[PDB]
Amino acid sequence: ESADLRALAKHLYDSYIKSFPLTKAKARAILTGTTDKSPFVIYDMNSLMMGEDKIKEVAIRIFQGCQFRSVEAVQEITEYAKSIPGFVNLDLNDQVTLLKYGVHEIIYTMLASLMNKDGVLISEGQGFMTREFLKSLRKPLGDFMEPKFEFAVKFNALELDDSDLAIFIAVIILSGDRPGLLNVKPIEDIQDNLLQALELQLKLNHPESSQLFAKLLQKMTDLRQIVTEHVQLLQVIKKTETDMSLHPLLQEIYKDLY
Amino acid sequence: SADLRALAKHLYDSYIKSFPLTKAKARAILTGKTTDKSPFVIEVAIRIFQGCQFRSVEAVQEITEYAKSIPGFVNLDLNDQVTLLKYGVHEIIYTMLASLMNKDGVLISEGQGFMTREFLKSLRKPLGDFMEPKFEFAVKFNALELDDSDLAIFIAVIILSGDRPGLLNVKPIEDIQDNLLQALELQLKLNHPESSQLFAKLLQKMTDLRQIVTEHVQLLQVIKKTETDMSLHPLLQEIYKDLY
Ligand SMILES: O=C(O)[C@H](Cc1ccccc1)Oc1ccc(-c2ccccc2)cc1
Numbered sequence: 368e369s370a371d372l373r374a375l376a377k378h379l380y381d382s383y384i385k386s387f388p389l390t391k392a393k394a395r396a397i398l399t400g401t402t403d404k405s406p407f408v409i410y411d412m413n414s415l416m417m418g419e420d421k422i423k424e425v426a427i428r429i430f431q432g433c434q435f436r437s438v439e440a441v442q443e444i445t446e447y448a449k450s451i452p453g454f455v456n457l458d459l460n461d462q463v464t465l466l467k468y469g470v471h472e473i474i475y476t477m478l479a480s481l482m483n484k485d486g487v488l489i490s491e492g493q494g495f496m497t498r499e500f501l502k503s504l505r506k507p508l509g510d511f512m513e514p515k516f517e518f519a520v521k522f523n524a525l526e527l528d529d530s531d532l533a534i535f536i537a538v539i540i541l542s543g544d545r546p547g548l549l550n551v552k553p554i555e556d557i558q559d560n561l562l563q564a565l566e567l568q569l570k571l572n573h574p575e576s577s578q579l580f581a582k583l584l585q586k587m588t589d590l591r592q593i594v595t596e597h598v599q600l601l602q603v604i605k606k607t608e609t610d611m612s613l614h615p616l617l618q619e620i621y622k623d624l625y
Numbered sequence: 626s627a628d629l630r631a632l633a634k635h636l637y638d639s640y641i642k643s644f645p646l647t648k649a650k651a652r653a654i655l656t657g658k659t660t661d662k663s664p665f666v667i668e669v670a671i672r673i674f675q676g677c678q679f680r681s682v683e684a685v686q687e688i689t690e691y692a693k694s695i696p697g698f699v700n701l702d703l704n705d706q707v708t709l710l711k712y713g714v715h716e717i718i719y720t721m722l723a724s725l726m727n728k729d730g731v732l733i734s735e736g737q738g739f740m741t742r743e744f745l746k747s748l749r750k751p752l753g754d755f756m757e758p759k760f761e762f763a764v765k766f767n768a769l770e771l772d773d774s775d776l777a778i779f780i781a782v783i784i785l786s787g788d789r790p791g792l793l794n795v796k797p798i799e800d801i802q803d804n805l806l807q808a809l810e811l812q813l814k815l816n817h818p819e820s821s822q823l824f825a826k827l828l829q830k831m832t833d834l835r836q837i838v839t840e841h842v843q844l845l846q847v848i849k850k851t852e853t854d855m856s857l858h859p860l861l862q863e864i865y866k867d868l869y
């Protein structure tokens with residue numbers, strides 16, 4: 368096929384644009400000092416102090432920032448998922464299972480688009496927080512973002528664009544091996560087609576590269592472990608951080624009471 | 626008193642620092658006499674509920690800060706601090722939400738808007754049911770006419786509840802709560818002399834709070850198991866429950 372596979376890729380790209388406000392192209396334009404308002408750079412504490420002026424303690428603020436982001440991201444990703452042909456015809460429980468596992472893997476995928484070697488874009492491109500600043504933080508915070516940077520630098524060296532990413536994300540969501548799925552076949556049928564679309568897309572968009580498709584499938588597997596490592600940093604915090612302002616208490620509430 | 630009145634003052638001052646919209650502020654807006662920018666009067670199912678989810682994120686931080694200011698609290702075993710806050714948060718969210726409600730609707734976005742009760746009740750099948758029980762609670766709660774000074778102590782008593790499941794050291798929690806209860810009582814006697822039995826009514830309300838929370842959780846569980854549209858599931862809550 369081409370037509371259909373190409374048509375599918377375009378459909379995914381269009382819905383990705385509708386669902387996700389900050390695209391990689393947008394982020395890359397800003398990270399390329401394309402001067403249409405340079406981002407404010409947060410690079411030491413002196414410069415952190417000023418950052419509450421030209422944007423919308425520091426540990427708390429960074430952590431709450433992440434929690435807010437997850438709220439927004441779930442809605443964006445859910446909308447994207449619903450646009451994947453076949454998805455909303457799956458059993459309700461399986462739709463839940465797929466999104467439940469897919470969400471965080473996609474958050475870290477898309478976070479890479481805002482990162483480079485040196486730091487991460489924040490507040491919708493208004494600011495840039497330095498990697499080494501994040502590293503210098505206090506005990507819980509110092510090693511929180513670093514694994515996401517490690518992931519991102521290697522991920523970004525593959526040079527995917529938004530068109531690639533739209534199909535990548537769709538393949539991840541339609542993963543037939545999530546624990547607890549009830550009907551695997553229809554999920555796999557959809558994913559097989561998405562994988563063919565991805566492959567064709569990569570062949571057309573990436574002449575210079577070898578084995579990009581296979582590399583990308585490796586990355587889908589790596590994401591699983593990025594999720595599990597993040598969850599485990601949080602568990603250490605729950606058991607050892609003396610200051611309740613630094614615990615992810617909302618997460619504990621939903622787990623134990625809801 | 627010295628201590629009991631001093632404790633009441635300390636709690637009130639920290640409540641003011643920790644919680645931006647006070648009942649007095651809210652009551653002033655809900656007074657169309659006090660015109661200093663009238664509130665704007667109000668898919669939607671999704672938007673309103675994402676709005677609640679955002680609010681919970683913010684509220685946890687405010688309440689945590691308040692809790693830390695209660696003398697004794699930060700010296701408790703860490704597990705117990707977690708347990709107390711974990712159960713306290715939603716009960717306090719609904720307590721404080723009552724301050725923004727009257728029988729006709731609820732103040733939102735820091736007093737910038739007013740959503741009518743009728744509008745909230747009219748929504749689609751899952752959504753219609755969410756806010757109404759909170760309104761029922763609030764109307765009766767607000768007829769007790771507590772002010773912010775009262776509320777500061779009320780909330781502290783709730784947080785220091787010695788019967789939360791999973792507590793390891795009950796005694797030190799009860800010692801602090803016994804004092805908070807005495808402060809509350811004295812406060813109510815001094816601030817609401819005309820209101821015999823207010824203290825007892827307030828303790829009933831603490832228990833009712835636990836019911837409100839449980840009903841809200843249950844509405845959400847029905848949704849998780851029966852709503853065909855994923856946009857209407859509380860997917861974040863499902864993620865933290867199953868994976869985290
Ligand atoms: O687990 C999640 O949903 C997010 C995921 C995320 C991670 C990096 C950027 C954006 C989102 O990570 C969090 C990290 C820390 C916290 C948190 C919040 C308050 C206090 C302590 C930790 C919450 C979520």
Ligand SMILES: O=C(O)[C@H](Cc1ccccc1)Oc1ccc(-c2ccccc2)cc1
Pocket residue numbers: 674675676677678680681718722841856857858859860
């Ligand atoms: O349970 C919670 O943490 C909040 C509590 C709350 C209730 C009213 C005002 C502020 C907070 O209520 C929610 C209600 C619905 C939802 C939700 C979100 C997305 C899709 C479906 C339901 C999330 C939270």
